[PDB]
Amino acid sequence: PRKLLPSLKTKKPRELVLVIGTGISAAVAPQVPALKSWKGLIQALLDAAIDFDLLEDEESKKFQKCLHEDKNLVHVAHDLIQKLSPRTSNVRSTFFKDCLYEVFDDLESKMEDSGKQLLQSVLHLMENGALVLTTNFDNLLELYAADQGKQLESLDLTDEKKVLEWAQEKRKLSVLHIHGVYTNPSGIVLHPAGYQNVLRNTEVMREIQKLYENKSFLFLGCGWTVDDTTFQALFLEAVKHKSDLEHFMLVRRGDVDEFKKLRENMLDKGIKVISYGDDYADLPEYFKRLTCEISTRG
Amino acid sequence: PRKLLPSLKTKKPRELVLVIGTGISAAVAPQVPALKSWKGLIQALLDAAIDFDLLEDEESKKFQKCLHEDKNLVHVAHDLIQKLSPRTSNVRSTFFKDCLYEVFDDLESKMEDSGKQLLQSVLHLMENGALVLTTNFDNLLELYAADQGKQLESLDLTDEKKVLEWAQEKRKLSVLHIHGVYTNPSGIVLHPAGYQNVLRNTEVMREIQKLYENKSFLFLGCGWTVDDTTFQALFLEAVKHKSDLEHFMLVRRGDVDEFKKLRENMLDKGIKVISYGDDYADLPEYFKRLTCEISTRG
């Protein structure tokens, strides 16, 4: 198989900042449309909007029409967010709560060991002291973290005190959601202009330079992530040094052409490349070894 | 066994300049491919390149193809160096660092007393004040030198100031690597034209005559180093006196024919022959005696 990663073995778990994307959510049993892919997310919220009649026939037809010939997924998800927000004050919004909390539940009932190893290694990293952020609305990881008895809370960008106090890292055992959480419907912001107004403080992205300048990330199930504008604006807007980065990322192998294409474009971004077997079943053993040597040397 | 060397006994250890080659690295437990033989080094790098996918299948196939029907081993190692160097600026080159630092580690875990006596007597020679240079990429000797508490630095030909102040022998307790070191990936140069441009100063090779003209070397695990072109380029190009040399070299005995052919050819070069017992086990006692008598008379 693929042996121990050269750099990863010697990095301290403190500097390790794990990032989880659609790959880990797809490691969970793929029967919920929300977790197979990002495309199946918007399809899931569609099916939830049609069956719960939040949205009349013609405009569900429009949003479906976006699906076949598609472009600009994040804008379309934002157009959705905007059209489902005519609410007055709170009114326990049935246009929001009763769609996201329909789509993103029924998740635990389809949990197996093959995805379970991922988050148990994650709990090993957190008990080492590693910081973790995610890119999905789901909340399965911290639910099963609470399953064995480790309380893990969901954070967002709306709560200013928690974001301000989270950048300095004193609050360990905490996972920030760069997109949102279904357990807190008022805490999701996705449009590019929505996370800029709450981040009006230029001193608080001075407090985020400690993530990208010095701390080491590890993008799991990513790569299309570095393509959309959210990570460019939260990571690469306020830093001009691509010559000396310490960030890492893990994806599948496959056809050699896109292999070298991703190689070159995220060397231009400045992350290291790791592709191992595209077998969908050697990532568990490889990543759980990674975590255990990290914990032992840590 | 083989008693004390007639000439060596009376040499003061300052005149002694120890050279270590593939024999000492093979004295270490021979299960890393890198240290059993020079041949074994390039296959270790080839195996590292295949499993980490620096080169595609066909390039690795060509590289494998040179192995079976071989020639120009240093030339092929340079071809490997050139094709693994498309990097931009530094970019913590994954084509170099993540290959050499994979191959040349996992070395200390296989360290035993039979190889330990060699380096511990080496430490004796250093505390006498002898000079030592190496011909292999490894840094096991300096690592275990630092094990008991003696700090030993790895030097190369790239840093011009260190090489300039090193030829005078003002800097003691220092070891240059005629080939390179794995702890400094940017400090390795092997192709014949690489160590001439950095050595553009003919006055600095005039500062090198004090090695070959007056200082006494002692080549351990050598004999094939006087066959390739690096030793001839750095030693015999600027020296025209083979009538009066003062240099030594130690190797195995064996077939009498090959014994006398090496005898004659390196008498033509101008070194003394010592072949003892090819038992792979009386070199420790013989060389450790040699070193203790030199230290006592030093």
Residue numbers in the entry:
A (entry chain C), B (entry chain B): 28 to 325
What does the paper say about this structure?
To perform cryoEM reconstruction, we treated filament fragments composed of several protomers as a single particle. The part of each FAM118B protomer that is well resolved in the density maps is limited precisely to residues 28–325 for both FAM118B and FAM118B24–334, indicating that the flexibility of N and C extremities extends slightly beyond the parts truncated in the shorter construct. Both FAM118B and FAM118B24–334 structures show essentially the same assembly where each successive protomer is translated forward and rotated by approximately 40° around the longitudinal axis, creating a helical arrangement.
We show that human FAM118B forms head-to-tail filaments both in vitro and in living human cells, a feature that appears to be conserved in both FAM118B and its paralog FAM118A across vertebrates. As expected, the FAM118B sirtuin domain comprises the large Rossmann-fold subdomain and a small α-helical subdomain but lacks a zinc-binding module.
